[PDB]
């Protein structure tokens, strides 16, 4: 259960990191609105990660 949920906790960071691609690529389109919506996901994953 530790190994499993640790993999999931790592994968939440892996998601945060991948969602930097989302925010960065949105900025490379000029889509601030979409970059904010990526930052909301990175925020919600950060919140999740603490609890785990």
């Amino acid at each position: 259960a530790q190994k499993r949920s640790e993999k999931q906790y790592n994968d939440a960071q892996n998601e945060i990191n991948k969602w930097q691609r989302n925010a960065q690529l949105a900025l490379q389109k000029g889509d601030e609105n979409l970059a904010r919506q990526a930052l909301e996901r990175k925020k919600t994953y950060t919140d999740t990660s603490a609890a785990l």
């Binding site: 925010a23 960065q24 900025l27 601030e32 970059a35 904010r36 930052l39 909301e40 925020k43």
Partner: peptide
């Protein structure tokens, strides 16, 4: 706070 991070991230 997302704007503050975003404006720094878009700046470079």
């Amino acid at each position: 706070d997302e704007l503050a991070a975003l404006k720094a991230q878009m700046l470079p």
